[PDB]
Write a structure and sequence with these properties.
The PDB classes it as ras-binding domain. The entry lists the keywords RAS, RA. It forms a monomeric assembly. The protein is α+β, with helices and mostly antiparallel strands. It has one domain: Ubiquitin-like (UB roll) (Roll), CATH 3.10.20.90. Helix content is 17%, strand content 32%. It has a 5-stranded mixed sheet with strand order 2-1-5-3-4.
Length: 93
């Protein structure tokens, strides 16, 4: 469908309540650590690396999903849901 294949996802940080929800475009080969590079540069959180951050997709108002380091975001997200993404740190949890 269409030339290539890309979409815009919404990325919030691991905060709690509403925040500075950022938005970025993802392409077929879009890797977890890639989406994070964008989302991170956006949030000015160079303090840490991309590798130290989980990519989570939010489906329901409680049901979240997890994206591996190379799962083509375009193909690793719950389509039936919304393109909402959380950037979480790989803290001791």
């Amino acid at each position: 469908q269409q030339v290539g294949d890309c979409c815009i996802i919404r990325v919030s940080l691991d905060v709690d309540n509403g925040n500075m929800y950022k938005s970025i475009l993802v392409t077929s080969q879009d890797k977890a650590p890639a989406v994070i590079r964008k989302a991170m540069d956006k949030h000015n959180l160079e303090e840490e690396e991309p590798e130290d951050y989980e990519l989570l997709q939010i489906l329901s108002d409680d049901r979240k999903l997890k994206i591996p380091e190379n799962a083509n975001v375009f193909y690793a997200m719950n389509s039936t849901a919304n393109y909402d993404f959380v950037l979480k740190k790989r803290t001791f949890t």
